[PDB]
Amino acid sequence: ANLRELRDRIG
Amino acid sequence: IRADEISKIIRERIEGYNREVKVVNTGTVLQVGDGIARIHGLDEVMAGELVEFEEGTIGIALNLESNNVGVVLMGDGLMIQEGSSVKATGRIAQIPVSEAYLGRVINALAKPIDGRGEITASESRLIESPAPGIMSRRSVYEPLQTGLIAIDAMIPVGRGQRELIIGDRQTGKTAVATDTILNQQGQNVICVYVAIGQKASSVAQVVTNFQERGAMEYTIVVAETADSPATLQYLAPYTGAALAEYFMYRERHTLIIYDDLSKQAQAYRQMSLLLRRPPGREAYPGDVFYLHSRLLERAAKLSSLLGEGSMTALPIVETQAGDVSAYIPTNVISITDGQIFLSADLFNAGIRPAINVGISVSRVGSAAQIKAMKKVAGKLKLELAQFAELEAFAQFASDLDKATQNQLARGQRLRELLKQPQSAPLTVEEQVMTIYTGTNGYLDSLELDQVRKYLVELRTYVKTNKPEFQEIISSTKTFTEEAEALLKEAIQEQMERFLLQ
Amino acid sequence: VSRVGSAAQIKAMKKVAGKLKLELAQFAELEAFAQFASDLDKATQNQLARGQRLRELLKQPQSAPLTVEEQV
Amino acid sequence: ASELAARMTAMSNATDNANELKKTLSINYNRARQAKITGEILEIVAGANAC
């Protein structure tokens, strides 16, 4: 779930 | 390339080869690793049978391979020289258990480590005994006064519940568990504090605070150092569970605290890797989930037919960097009756203890409380989650309704009244009157920091004035209209006395 | 994106496709100025409105095929 | 006019801050994805080597 929240914070 | 071929076993086997004989009586020592030894022979031992080495060290025969036995060592095996002999004691890892262990620091060898004397305990029990089934269980319907008002009210642990106390570094987990133990001094329960892989000075600290605070008569501190081998750390919570399982089978109410359960998990990973077994996610074996399951599934309440002596667990898991993605915390969250999360970003922010109410889960709910606290704390956790989730949005807006702002003031008083100090627990009547004066808007007319200074003096007010409140709450076990009228008179008079002060 | 490109678009299709992708790129760059179209320039306001018209033209129901006549 | 000008300056500074923050979050995200892929391949080849 780390990469998901990372990508979503980037967006 | 293959063990059990060391050119001395080969001559021993070639000297007689008109035979199909077995050597079930004895066994030989081929290898000794860094605490794990390979045994040749032992053709009648069980999977888990204790094996006695030549020097007089005991081990368990976990990996029963074809021609050879891989035995883990229940001690530091500096003395096991290869080519020596072993035996088989026929008993499968049994410990003595009786009502005489009360109040002492106990090794995982079920032998004292404080020198107060050799303990007497006749009847012995497996170190790993299976969990009770479903016919031997009944639903959880008892209170468990934790002493901490937040956990008692909102996230209520009950007798039979197995509540996880999860968190991070220095967040107050061991402190919370020790308060849960120390509060019990009038409920006649038998607590056990099994400290796995904790620092020895800290074990001495908590045991001397136990022996000074008064709850040594209840408790047993099943603790070892860090330099016990991985077998001892992996086995210690099973010893604690065995003692508590004996006691709940003796229909006495128990409460056990594993501390921690990441240390036992990595200490199982140690012997799993040193036995050349495959690694799963983050090098743990995949069966660590089943390990924690077959440990934790024992704690419950017994049925009417088996004495109803409950068994309460309180596992503790620390999460590095504050996550749930790690394998061991995810496992233990899945197994328990919900979790109790603690955050450092709340702990350093004046909220001590730092129970994040928004993500802390109690799966038994208000069925583990008396009808008084069940009445006043009907939906207080949920309305507190609502107050938090609207206070978060109230930072992205400029001007609000006065209605929402009054609701914010009442919710702030609600969040403020539950800050209980460590080594300073409450009682059920204190909690019910405090939370009643809280949720009924009866604090929204005063200052934020004024709430606790108000409420401790109100608690002492009802303490010195009305034993009728005590007896109505403690005899009938409900918050009724007579006690409510008494409490409303208390609110009015204390507000008068503060307006004077 | 398609790397074959306009080679499999018919002559009736390519001209309207080029104008449509022109206006749809100019709509995708002026997207964030959605509620600011009241404060935008009049021409860019027409661009945003027409791009919204094109995007809502782009919808269709599931499994309702449209021949090249209907598409053009 | 002055409040719209000051707000324009504030928006420009916020866009520059968001630029730099986006660049740093992209760097850290690439690093996290790489370390995750490496951890996966490491544990896979370790579990395979074991058998």
Next chain:
Amino acid sequence: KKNLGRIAQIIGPVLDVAFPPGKMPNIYNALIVKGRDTAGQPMNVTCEVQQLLGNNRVRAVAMSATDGLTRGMEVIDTGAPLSVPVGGATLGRIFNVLGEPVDNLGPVDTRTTSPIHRSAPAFTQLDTKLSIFETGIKVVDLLAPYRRGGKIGLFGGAGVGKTVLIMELINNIAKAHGGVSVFGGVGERTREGNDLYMEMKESGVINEQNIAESKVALVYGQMNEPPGARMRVGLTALTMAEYFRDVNEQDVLLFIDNIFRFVQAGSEVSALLGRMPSAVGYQPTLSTEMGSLQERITSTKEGSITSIQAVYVPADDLTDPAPATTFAHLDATTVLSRGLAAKGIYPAVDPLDSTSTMLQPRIVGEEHYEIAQRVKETLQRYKELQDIIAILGLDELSEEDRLTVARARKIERFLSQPFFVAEVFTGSPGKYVGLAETIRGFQLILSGELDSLPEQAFYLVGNIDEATAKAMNLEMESKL
């Protein structure tokens, strides 16, 4: 049968048995160890074979405790898979994978039986029944219409309301259903199974006054069991349902909780069998095992099977391969989120990521589909605008945009119903909402004529009428 096998190597749950050179058992047969406990009485540890190891040796799987077995014990083949009692006999008894009644009651009718291992039906014998049936939960009714006889999986984390939702769903469906149910516990809390046992004994669906009149068969392979037990309890429950649909030929309900524990038991035993590990440590036979268990839950022209199964997601990351395969075998999914679970909305079924196959104009009607996709539109708009208002604020938007903000912040409250069994966690009386009520209430919320109510007055109400009553109550308590 009539042979003798020698235990040769016991690495925990896995067993190496040697047989005479001619007679060798087939794969997925059922050994039975004539072992003994610590008291020496002849006790059985039933055993399933998985693989011919070669050199007249095989590798097996132990269905029960391994602590107490020695190298040099004996074992006897049955020549067949692990047969389980079937029919009206297995109705109202706790069941294990070994076909043993676990509750303290007498023996069972042993003559009606069937093996575990079988395959999917004929593809030309599949029922294309797509009829909707009413559940009661507002989110479960409107945004995710459930296929009768279709499979349903409740993707969630640990402690967000999977078990509560499935228990209330049993509570609401099994009493008004028209067929015999079967519940299975696969790797879950034992005391919670006891709570289900007591709560369904008292609620009469066990009707324990007379046996064989119960409409549920309870199977339990929960957490404290060796990986063979959790590896085959799901198969046993499915085979009971397959008898009840193949000979009694009627609709059934089959709740397989928790299917992730089945997959995890498979991985724990597969890493030890010498399998080269797949993605993060699951077995390589992941998708084929998941299908081979899933695909025999199906409808047919003899009787459909409705299957609401609880499926677990580790760390709330839906990328992980066990949910990544379980999404590929489900009809109408339901994804309980941690966001709504921490926010306070119970049930925490996320309206957005949940998506079914039944919600079509030609399957449910046009206006239901239209108002549902408009609700999804408004919520997608709000979760789009969230990251903007995070730093922007509440006073730099439009009347359309702030209007949709307040409307969606009413909607996310309105989709929360206080369940029957949620009374211990909420403190609210029993509510069961109708589908017409939900669609009418969402037209009342969406069409703008409710933009003057208190915004917190939408939380945990059954009817939109009760939301108006909450508005009246809150304004009366504020104004006194």
Next chain:
Amino acid sequence: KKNLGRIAQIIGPVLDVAFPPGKMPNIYNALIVKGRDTAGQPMNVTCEVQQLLGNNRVRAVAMSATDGLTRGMEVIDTGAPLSVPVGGATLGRIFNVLGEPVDNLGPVDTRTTSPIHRSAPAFTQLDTKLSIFETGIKVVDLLAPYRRGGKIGLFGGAGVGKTVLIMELINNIAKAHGGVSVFGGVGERTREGNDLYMEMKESGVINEQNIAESKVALVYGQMNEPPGARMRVGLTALTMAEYFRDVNEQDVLLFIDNIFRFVQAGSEVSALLGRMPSAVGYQPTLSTEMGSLQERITSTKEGSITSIQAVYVPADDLTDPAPATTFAHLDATTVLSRGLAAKGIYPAVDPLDSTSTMLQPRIVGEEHYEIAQRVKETLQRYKELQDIIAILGLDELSEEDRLTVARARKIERFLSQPFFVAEVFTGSPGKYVGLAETIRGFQLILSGELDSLPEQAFYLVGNIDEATAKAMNLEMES
């Protein structure tokens, strides 16, 4: 006569020794392998017995350079485990991993030796006095006070002030505490091991005339040695302090730098010994490896050991497995951040991520602990606001928020303190500060008696009067 045996394998730092079938050495038995050099017989290469492989052979990590050690050479077992000399001769001398003087002085008394693999002291021997100990650092005096006899870890990445801070702690404390202080050099540059020696020579702690009363022992297994040496210098210094405690009864300071290299040595040797790969790259025997050091460093009824140590966190990652196992083996944590050092705050101790077991009202009183908790609360308010501060700035809050924002912005500079070692680096001489004025200065910052002046006075000063004088001095020269 001692049982001789011939080696069979060598794979870098791992030696496989065979023995006659009757006699095989016990665990950790030293194995004096003879070898062959250009200059006679070197003989200094030594091995510690780790495992017993069967068929009359073992496996033993070489404690020195393994080159030259040709296959098929006789190895004489000692019979006793690895044992260093200890006692009065060690005081004022630089020793090897094997208990051997390397500082070019006299060969010490080989009479009072002791084995390094002695077990952990028994749990019943614990004394439970909890004494505060101010040392002269604002974040150490205030935030996480130190405990006389406990283990106080220091954490930190690459060059974030670990060695500087521990040299400053030595410079302050060593002349005050009248006990022997055995610095240990485990896994760092030889420059530091030489510079500490030169400072103790010129200062007068190690003086050649009257070297017996030097009250310091040393050991230096620096970054030039094979992994066996880097793996055993920890236990060398541990027994060299354990004997002083157990017999001379002195309170003893212990310093190690840096024990993550001691853990990394085991991680580097476990892959060569054939043991399986554990968590991400480490060894499976990890927590017991850390315990084998830390648990023998508990104060007993006989004497006391206080063990400051730098625990390097790799790749600036704080939840690496080895620091993860290190964190529970301490009494106080002090993580040295990269952000605060990058912005120039020196020392860069992370305030709200550093905690001690002694920050409690029953120990440090109500005044100290109350003020410290309020300071940490303000700092955590700053940390929570840091997102919106970074993306946007300052004006968009209410002034009640900017009260704490400005207060924390002054505190984060008042936690800095000039060092008696870093006085040669920046240019401000070292300033020892006590707790009795630290608390008063922090109270004055919280209240608002010195708040209205700009924050840049508070940076890199000592007492609050130094802050007032610096504020007046900046308001003097335009």
